[PDB]
Design a protein around this ligand. Structure first.
Ligand SMILES: [Mg+2]
Ligand SMILES: [Mg+2]
Ligand SMILES: [Mg+2]
Ligand SMILES: [Mg+2]
Ligand SMILES: [Mg+2]
Ligand SMILES: [Mg+2]
Ligand SMILES: [Mg+2]
Ligand SMILES: [Mg+2]
Ligand SMILES: [Mg+2]
Ligand SMILES: [Mg+2]
Ligand SMILES: [Mg+2]
Ligand SMILES: [Mg+2]
Ligand SMILES: [Mg+2]
Ligand SMILES: [Mg+2]
Ligand SMILES: [Mg+2]
Ligand SMILES: [Mg+2]
Ligand SMILES: [Mg+2]
Ligand SMILES: [Mg+2]
Ligand SMILES: [Zn+2]
Ligand SMILES: [Zn+2]
Lengths: 25, 98, 127, 150, 81, 223
RNA sequence: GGUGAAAUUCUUGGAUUUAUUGAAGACUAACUACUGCGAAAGCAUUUGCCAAGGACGUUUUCAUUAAUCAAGAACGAAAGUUAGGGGAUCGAAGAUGAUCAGAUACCGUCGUAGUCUUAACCAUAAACUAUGCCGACUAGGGAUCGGGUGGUGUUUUUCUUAUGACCCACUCGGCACCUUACGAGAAAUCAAAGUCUUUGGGUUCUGGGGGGAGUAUGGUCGCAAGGCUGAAACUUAAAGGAAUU
């Protein structure tokens, strides 16, 4: 996997995580 | 490692050189990493000149040349044999062959 | 002694034009394109087609009375190509060898003083 | 090798060996002093005066002929300005830049330059305070700076 | 190279070398006795002016400033001090 | 040719047409140019109506004889229809691409100058200039660029010259002046102080705005 | 039209093409270079105004005012974010025609957002010379740009001219380059990446096997996207660099 793609994936994951956190709040 | 001390570009003292598009495939390439071949072709092909002359009103006529500078992205150049792969020892020669 | 017209060859990398007009360039005397003569679609540009077109044009010219032409050679120009198509030279040759008279030949390709953006994107036509 | 740019130049005046007055020069030190005083009265900065001396008259350097530097002489007579010359010049320059900025806002290069100038001024101010040429509280701002200039 | 007398070099070589970079620093500039074509007065003009130096009695402009060495006003005649 | 479109008797239109005669202004040598072809005058919509305004762009060598004028080109606007003859006026001077490009050599600065100016009539002309920097016959330096200040000065001078030369007399007069390249020579003479200079040409004269029509004046350029 | 070949699409209410023109927004070809300038990002049409700046010249002036910097500031490509104006081209998404076993990929045709701008934000790029800044010294060689000197040197010519442009020689400052290293280095290579086991000119920052991970968490800054800061458990004998046949 390209590093850039990995980074992108991570970012995507983090968005979801953020959303989850917001929901929890 | 560095394949080229020039980085294959020719800028150094600059910072950003504006890109020119490729004449073959439009691959946007910096104006220095550009491979510039200036083609002075005659407007009429070498074999078809005589006929033209025969046709022409006013004998002893100029017959002009067409002028254009061509910009090849390096890959394209490589493909089209404008440039060739050279040995490590003779990559260094900056002087044109002719 | 002579009757003059404007030959107006426009040869793109696909499909080629011949277009005889008067000296004013407003009124027309036969167009005839490479796609008219050969119906094989890829052969719109090929020299043979161009030659055929030129021949056709010549006949028309003869019929009208235009003994002589000035040729304006043209590529697609602007953002596109700039290099003349394969069926311009052929067309010219055909014109020459029809008994028709020649003189004053120029490139009229629409060269920009730097233009709008070219088609293809950053990485261009990746084949 | 320069203080705010990448510049590396070495262009400078090179003072001759002999402290003594040049052999060809006549006149008098007193005369020179008088001339200097006159110049000061007229309303010139030390450097300008020095330049004038060099050009119109036979004066190589004032310290070579009189025994004293021009600024010192000015001070002695009671003519040395409220603000030291270089500092004043710097302030003036800064003010011009500020004025320009006031007029046109998007000039980012100009803004950058202004900062540099300000820094330089601050440095100079600090130096002066240490030497106690300026009163030990003297600060540089905007309106105040303008006032000083004008 | 290798062995030199660095203390007293050839005069020509010294001349060639930049002012400052010489053995002891000394100016390349000099002073001039300027005679204006009209009145009989001698003014001592520095060769690298900056200011448009006039005669002390009459306004005539003897020298105009340039990059380095100042230019004399044609009718004027000088003598190196 | 086999592919057909969706597309959602008076054959040979040249039998519906007549030939005319392109008459150039008295400024040139070969005063008649060639043939122009127009439709026959139908009652309301005459032949002379759709003629006055037409531009015929012709080679300057084919008006003067000499082929040292081959690179130059002239636009001629049809104005007065005599009956068979049609009288033109100067519309625009041009350089052919094959000389303009030829003269743009690498390793020397090209100096390009613009100006818009009124004639002694009311003709608004935009006239252009090209000048190149010369390797002065003595040079070892493989370039010969001019400094920017010098270039600017040259441009200014050129502009001044152009202003002097237009504003003073008719468009016909201007054309006359132009044909044996006097203006270029003058420019060269002027600029020998600032920088050597070479291949000085007024390339491109563009007409922008003309006065009324004034038939008499036009006529006075023929006969 | 388009293409490797096609098809999509537009077309006898007349496409394409030809000629004059007009509007709109882009961009600034050729000239354009182992050339310029700027702190970097960056910056090529003309002219004017507005300040700024390096180098040079200087027998001008101040006289240690300096070098580098944790705190703090200023700018900061492109995308992206608000809200206006603009919206020609090109075009993430989308449609959509092919190609393929598949092909919401490359190729083709359209095409919102964006591309341009005005007020804000954002603070990152292979933001690269992957070479921190200031200073000294060591080796030749031509170039070239900026300035300055000396040439009864060439040309210009309006008679001396006087400039200007060249020509030669020297000189500071710059972008580089060529050959040797007697020095370095793992080597590729390097006039610095040299003057280091013959180890100390001054300083700021950063790294300490590979993964986990630029992740988790806590701060903090962002309207948001995100940025700056930044672990550990556990895991592993290699990951890597330059060269070789
Ligand atoms: Mg590799
Ligand atoms: Mg620089
Ligand atoms: Mg960059
Ligand atoms: Mg390929
Ligand atoms: Mg220094
Ligand atoms: Mg500092
Ligand atoms: Mg049509
Ligand atoms: Mg330049
Ligand atoms: Mg341009
Ligand atoms: Mg900090
Ligand atoms: Mg943007
Ligand atoms: Mg898609
Ligand atoms: Mg599909
Ligand atoms: Mg596509
Ligand atoms: Mg970073
Ligand atoms: Mg880095
Ligand atoms: Mg580790
Ligand atoms: Mg390897
Ligand atoms: Zn390409
Ligand atoms: Zn006098």
């Amino acid at each position: 996997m390209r590093a850039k793609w990995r980074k992108k994936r991570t970012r995507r994951l983090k968005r979801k995580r953020r959303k989850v956190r917001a929901r929890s709040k | 490692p560095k394949k080229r001390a020039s980085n294959g570009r020719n800028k150094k003292g600059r910072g950003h050189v504006k890109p020119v598009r490729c004449v073959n495939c439009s691959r946007s390439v910096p104006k220095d990493k550009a491979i510039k071949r200036m083609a002075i072709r005659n407007i009429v092909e070498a074999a078809a000149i005589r006929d033209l002359s025969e046709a022409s009103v006013y004998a002893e006529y100029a017959l002009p040349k067409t002028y254009n500078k061509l910009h090849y992205c390096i890959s394209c150049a490589i493909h089209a044999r404008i440039v060739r792969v050279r040995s490590r020892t003779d990559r260094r020669i900056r002087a044109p062959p002719q | 002694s002579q009757v003059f017209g404007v030959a107006r060859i426009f040869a793109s990398f696909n499909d080629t034009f011949v277009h005889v007009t008067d000296l004013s360039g407003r009124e027309t005397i036969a167009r005839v394109t490479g796609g008219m003569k050969v119906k094989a679609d890829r052969d719109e540009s090929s020299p043979y087609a161009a030659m055929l077109a030129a021949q056709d044009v010549a006949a028309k010219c003869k019929e009208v009375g235009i003994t002589a032409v000035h040729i304006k050679i043209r590529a697609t120009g602007g953002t596109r190509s700039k290099t003349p198509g394969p069926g311009g030279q052929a067309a010219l040759r055909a014109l020459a060898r029809s008994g028709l008279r020649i003189g004053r030949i120029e490139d009229v390709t629409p060269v920009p003083s730097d233009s709008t953006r070219k088609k293809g994107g950053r990485r261009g036509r990746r084949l | 090798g320069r203080m705010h740019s990448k510049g590396k130049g070495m262009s400078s005046s090179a003072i001759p060996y002999s402290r003594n007055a040049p052999a060809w020069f006549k006149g008098s030190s007193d005369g020179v002093v008088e001339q200097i005083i006159k110049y000061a009265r007229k309303g010139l900065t030390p450097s300008q005066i020095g330049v004038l001396l060099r050009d119109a008259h036979g004066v190589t350097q004032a310290k070579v002929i009189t025994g004293n530097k021009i600024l010192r002489i000015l001070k002695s007579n009671g003519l040395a300005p409220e603000i030291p010359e270089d500092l004043y010049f710097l302030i003036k320059k800064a003010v011009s830049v500020r004025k320009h900025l006031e007029r046109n806002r998007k000039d980012k290069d100009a803004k950058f330059r202004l900062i540099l100038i300000e820094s330089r001024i601050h440095r100079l101010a600090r130096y002066y305070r240490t030497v106690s040429v300026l009163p030990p509280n003297w600060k540089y701002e905007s309106a105040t700076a303008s006032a000083l200039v004008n | 190279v290798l062995v030199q007398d660095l203390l007293h070099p050839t005069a020509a070589s010294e001349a060639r070398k930049h002012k400052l970079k010489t053995l002891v620093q000394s100016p390349r500039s000099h002073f001039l006795d300027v005679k204006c074509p009209g009145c009989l007065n001698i003014t001592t003009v520095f060769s690298h002016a900056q200011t448009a130096v006039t005669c002390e009695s009459c306004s005539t402009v003897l020298c105009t400033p340039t990059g380095g060495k100042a230019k004399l006003s044609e009718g004027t005649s000088f003598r190196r001090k | 040719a086999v592919g057909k479109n969706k597309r959602l008797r008076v054959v040979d239109p040249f039998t519906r047409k007549e030939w005319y005669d392109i008459k150039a202004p008295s400024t040139f040598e070969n005063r008649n140019v060639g043939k122009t072809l127009v439709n026959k005058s139908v009652g309301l919509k005459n032949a002379s109506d759709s003629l006055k305004g037409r531009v015929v762009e012709v080679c300057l060598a084919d008006l003067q004889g000499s082929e040292d004028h081959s690179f130059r080109k002239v636009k001629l606007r049809v104005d007065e229809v005599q009956g068979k003859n049609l009288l033109t006026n100067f519309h625009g001077m041009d350089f052919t691409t094959d000389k303009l490009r030829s003269m743009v050599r690498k390793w020397q600065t090209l100096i390009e100058a613009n100006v818009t100016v009124k004639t002694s009539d009311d003709y608004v002309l935009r006239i252009f200039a090209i000048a190149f920097t010369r390797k002065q016959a003595n040079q070892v330096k493989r370039t010969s660029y001019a400094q920017s200040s010098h270039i600017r000065q040259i441009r200014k001078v050129i502009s001044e010259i152009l202003t002097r030369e237009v504003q003073n007399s008719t468009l016909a007069q201007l054309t006359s002046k132009l044909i044996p390249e006097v203006i270029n020579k003058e420019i060269e003479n002027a600029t020998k102080d600032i920088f050597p200079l070479q291949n000085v040409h007024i390339r491109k004269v563009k007409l922008l705005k003309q006065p009324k029509f004034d038939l008499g004046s036009l006529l006075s350029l023929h006969g």
